[PDB]
Design a protein around this nucleic acid. Structure first.
Lengths: 245, 92, 129, 54, 28, 49, 161, 148, 19
RNA sequence: GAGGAAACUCAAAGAGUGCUAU
């Protein structure tokens, strides 16, 4: 994907086929993992274009209020994909009906630069210019967790370890960092007693998830001060619009 | 208990890249392998278990604008990766 | 005292990069401005940039990827020699190989690199790094 | 992706089967390294399937 | 209804199983 | 949930070892998402799509 | 770069057109010359050394491009000759080029293969031996393979196929 | 078991006969920052100041400290990553670089220390036979190096 | 040279000294 | 206050170790 989206074969030095919806350039692309013949692309005019190799032509296009920097297809859902957008939001889309999004994620304060599905398909991780990595549950619209440190300067690549147990992050400081998918979990093999005891904490926590005290403890995170001031002012801006409208 | 166990960071891949990292590709067939690129035009293949590089190539004069790992079917012992850059070339 | 349009554009780009803004609108535009911009862009410090013609001076909007440390227009317009170029870089750039001094010569506006390769000289405009 | 392990003992050859595969990404993390010392965890990883004395 | 219906059999089956465990009681 | 009645009915029985049988304890607790420790999880393939 | 490669292709075409009017084109020597092109086509020390260069050399291999470029010229020259001079269009004169034709048919570059197809169409009527006749059969198989891999028939290679 | 460290076999009183060209310089965090301020190249300046080939070393601690500094000093991080600079691994939890350099120096007596921190400088002065390197004015200066 | 809103300013003496 | 002798004695703890603790 450059000025034009081109299909290539390894054994042919020239581009085998030329795909293009229009004169616009293409910023990113991602093949599907289940319907491998379907491809999606991102354009600089704030557009998302879908393609099918079986027809060798683009299939559908939708224009957004802002550019999408990355697009990831759900490994467990062939028709379902997520898009990293420049309005601090990640949008979850069903291919067949693109007039609406399936879900929206809002917890970042800078444009999300990369997004990745867990190979299990039930979590998504997002990387943003705001020096943070967020993990979202697929059916929930807010991140369950935030990762950060001074030493990471701008997230541009975020990936899930193919076993779904770790997160790989790439930032502009020149370091590729590894993160646990779940901070409290440990990779060591557990005894059946530990497995049952550690499991019990989960359902019991899920059992009383919304209790006031547990919400105070469970939700709480150490967020960098730069992010909250962005969040706090953002909430003020949203409230003024809502009180207004 | 979960909070004082919340211990996410594990480590970093070797010494990283020279310039900012802009392209990471995972081996969908291998758990412990990555290809990473930076604006320096250098690409690195990593062994996640070792946090050490299989190899590093100064692939492009320009910026590594895309990176992907593949299993080319040319018409076990070696793996293959594809890199594209603003210098108007893609290298296997 | 008002400043040159080049200086205004440079300051806007620097400010926005430093505040983390990813898009900058520059007004007015000019051939010196635009040419200096593709020089940056070839060196990758900036990304996509776009030109509005308003039937007037015109406007630019520039994508920023955050790799710009500092860019500036140097003054006054003093001439630079080929075989001597290096020392000005050592004076006007943070380090030996880091940054690019921009120079307008008989063959156009260019960094000092394409300059010494073409054995051309002329007037210095500024720096980017 | 390891399913069987060959070990050679002075009495004879021993073949083992890997029930569980340890994490490769965190292979050097302290907890997995401690498991190799720990018999209890280690027994879960592999089991003896055949032994052929000289 | 389905998810809420299902948990109700997780209810009734659990309590019924617990009642069955009243048999193992070592003494009287 | 739709009202309190659906809630407290979901909340009525514990899950605990003291409270429910060892077997009943195990099926009430086994998680929905289960993955092998160090194996490749591949994208699904459908029979005739 | 590609733009210069396109420029080189033009000159090689201009050179080929000149041969058509060259008196050497009527002699038997050219066939040997085209034959030649085909076969021609086919720590303590660093602890002590000061290093002042931070740039590493970029890996490039243009030898294959030279091989294809030379290969393309000889095919175009050969086809131009045999079409223009009927006497050279004979089994004995063109028996030696068959092993080069089959090799050119497997080449990754489409243009050389296109020229390989053009000459083979020229030689279809010409009689050939058992070993020199299978090339027609093999090429018929290959063009189907090109059609199979190709997404669309509207391709310069496929159309010639 | 009371313990008295032996004085290094490399040392004749206050003289380090062991150190010979080419030298080893351990780089401190401030030394990069002041180097950029004075527009003095890391490698050329050392070889100019000392008139010998110099093999700079950056430990993990100082590398962490630079890249802790933040966006303002991204230039220093980039220069610190110059390939002519070699990197030195560490095996202690703390990221405090001042103590790490001191511990290495007490233990191995071929190392020059390039720093400007007044706190560090006196300590290395107390440690015998350790040449002290700093950037001052327009170029580097070496204090306790008999060969110059 | 000194930095200003108009741009970095270099004195004539500096130009001669560097030159 | 400092001690000594006896043990199939009675206690309160610490550390390590062993045994399919599956």
């Amino acid at each position: 994907g450059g000025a034009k989206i081109h299909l290539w074969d390894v054994n042919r030095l020239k581009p085998v086929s030329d795909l293009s919806w229009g004169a616009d350039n293409i910023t990113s692309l991602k093949f599907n993992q289940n319907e491998t013949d379907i491809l999606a692309s991102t354009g600089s005019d704030n557009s998302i274009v879908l393609y099918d190799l079986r027809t060798n032509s683009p299939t559908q296009k939708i224009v957004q209020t802002m550019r999408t920097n990355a697009i990831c297809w759900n490994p467990m859902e062939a028709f379902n994909f997520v898009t990293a957008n420049e309005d601090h939001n990640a949008y979850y889309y069903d291919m067949r009906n693109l007039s609406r999004s399936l879900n929206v994620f809002k917890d970042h304060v800078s444009a999300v630069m990369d997004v990745d599905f867990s190979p299990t398909g039930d979590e998504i991780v997002t990387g943003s210019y705001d020096k943070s990595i967020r993990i979202y549950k697929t059916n929930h619209g807010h991140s369950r967790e935030i990762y950060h440190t001074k030493r990471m300067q701008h997230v541009f690549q975020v990936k899930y370890s193919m076993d779904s147990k770790y997160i790989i992050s790439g930032s502009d400081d020149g370091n590729v960092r590894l993160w646990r998918s779940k901070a409290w979990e440990r990779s060591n093999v557990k005894t059946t007693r530990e497995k049952n005891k550690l499991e019990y904490d989960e359902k019991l926590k899920e059992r009383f998830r919304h209790m006031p005290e547990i919400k105070r403890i469970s939700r709480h995170r150490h967020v960098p001060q730069v992010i909250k001031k962005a969040q706090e002012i953002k909430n003020i801006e949203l409230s003024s619009i809502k009180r207004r409208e | 208990l979960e909070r004082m166990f919340a211990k996410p960071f594990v480590g970093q891949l070797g010494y990283g890249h020279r310039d900012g990292v802009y392209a990471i590709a995972k081996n969908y067939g291998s758990l412990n392998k990555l290809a990473t690129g930076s604006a320096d035009g250098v690409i690195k293949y990593w062994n996640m278990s070792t946090r050490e590089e299989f190899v590093s190539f100064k692939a492009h004069y320009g910026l590594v604008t895309g990176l992907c790992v593949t299993q080319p079917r040319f018409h076990k012992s070696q793996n293959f990766m594809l890199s594209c850059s603003d210098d108007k070339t893609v290298k296997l | 005292t008002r400043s040159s349009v080049l200086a205004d554009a440079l300051n806007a780009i620097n400010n926005a990069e430093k505040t983390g803004k990813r898009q900058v609108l520059i007004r007015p535009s000019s051939k010196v401005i635009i040419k200096f911009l593709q020089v940056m862009q070839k060196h990758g410090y900036i990304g996509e940039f776009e030109y509005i013609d308003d039937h007037r001076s015109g406007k630019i909007v520039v994508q920023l990827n955050g790799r710009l440390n500092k860019c500036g227009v140097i003054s006054p317009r003093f001439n630079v020699k080929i075989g001597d170029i290096e020392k000005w870089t050592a004076n006007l750039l943070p380090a030996r190989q880091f940054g690019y001094v921009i120079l307008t010569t008989s063959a156009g506006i260019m960094d000092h690199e394409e300059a010494r390769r073409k054995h051309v000289s002329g007037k210095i405009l500024g720096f980017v790094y | 992706p390891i399913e069987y392990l060959l070990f050679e003992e002075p009495t004879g050859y021993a073949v083992f089967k890997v029930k569980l595969q340890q994490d490769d990404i965190g292979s050097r993390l302290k907890e997995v390294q401690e498991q190799i010392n720990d018999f209890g965890a280690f027994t879960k990883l592999i089991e003896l399937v055949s032994f052929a004395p000289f | 209804r389905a998810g809420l219906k299902k948990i109700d059999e997780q209810y009734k089956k659990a309590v019924s199983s617990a009642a069955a465990t009243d048999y193992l009681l070592p003494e009287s | 949930f739709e009202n309190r009645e659906q809630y407290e009915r979901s909340l009525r029985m514990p899950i605990g070892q003291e409270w429910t049988s060892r077997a009943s304890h195990q099926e009430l607790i086994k998680p929905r998402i289960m993955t092998k420790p160090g194996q490749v999880i591949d994208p699904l393939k459908a029979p005739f799509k | 770069n590609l733009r210069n490669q396109n420029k080189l292709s033009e000159l090689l075409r201009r050179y080929l057109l000149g041969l058509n009017h060259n008196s050497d084109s009527e002699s038997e020597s050219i066939l040997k010359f085209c034959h030649q092109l085909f076969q021609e086509s086919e720590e303590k020390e660093d602890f002590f050394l000061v290093n002042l260069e931070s740039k590493s050399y970029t890996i490039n291999s243009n030898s294959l491009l030279l091989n294809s470029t030379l290969q393309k010229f000889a095919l175009d020259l050969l086809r131009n000759v045999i079409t223009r001079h009927r006497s050279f269009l004979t089994v004995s004169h063109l028996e030696g080029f068959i092993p080069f034709l089959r090799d050119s048919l497997l080449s990754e570059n489409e243009g050389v293969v296109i020229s390989t197809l053009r000459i083979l169409i020229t030689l279809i009527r010409l009689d050939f031996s058992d070993e020199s006749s299978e090339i027609f059969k093999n090429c018929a198989r290959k063009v189907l393979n090109i059609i199979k891999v190709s997404p669309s028939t509207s391709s310069e290679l496929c159309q010639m196929g | 078991t009371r313990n008295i460290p032996q004085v290094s076999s490399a040392l004749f009183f206050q003289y380090n006969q062991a150190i010979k060209p080419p030298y080893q310089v351990l780089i401190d965090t401030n030394f990069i920052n002041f180097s950029i301020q004075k527009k003095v190249d890391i490698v050329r300046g050392m070889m100019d100041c000392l008139l010998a080939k110099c093999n700079p070393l950056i430990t993990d601690c100082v590398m962490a400290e630079l890249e802790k500094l933040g966006p303002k000093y991204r230039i220093a991080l980039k220069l610190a990553r110059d390939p002519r600079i070699k990197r030195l691994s560490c095996s202690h939890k703390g990221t405090y670089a001042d103590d790490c350099l001191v511990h290495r120096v007490l233990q191995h007596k071929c190392y020059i220390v390039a720093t400007n921190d007044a706190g560090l400088k006196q300590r290395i002065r107390k440690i015998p036979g350790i040449p002290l390197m700093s950037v001052g004015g327009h170029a580097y200066v070496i204090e306790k190096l008999p060969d110059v | 040279g000194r930095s200003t809103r108009n741009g970095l300013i270099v004195s004539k003496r500096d130009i001669a000294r560097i030159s």
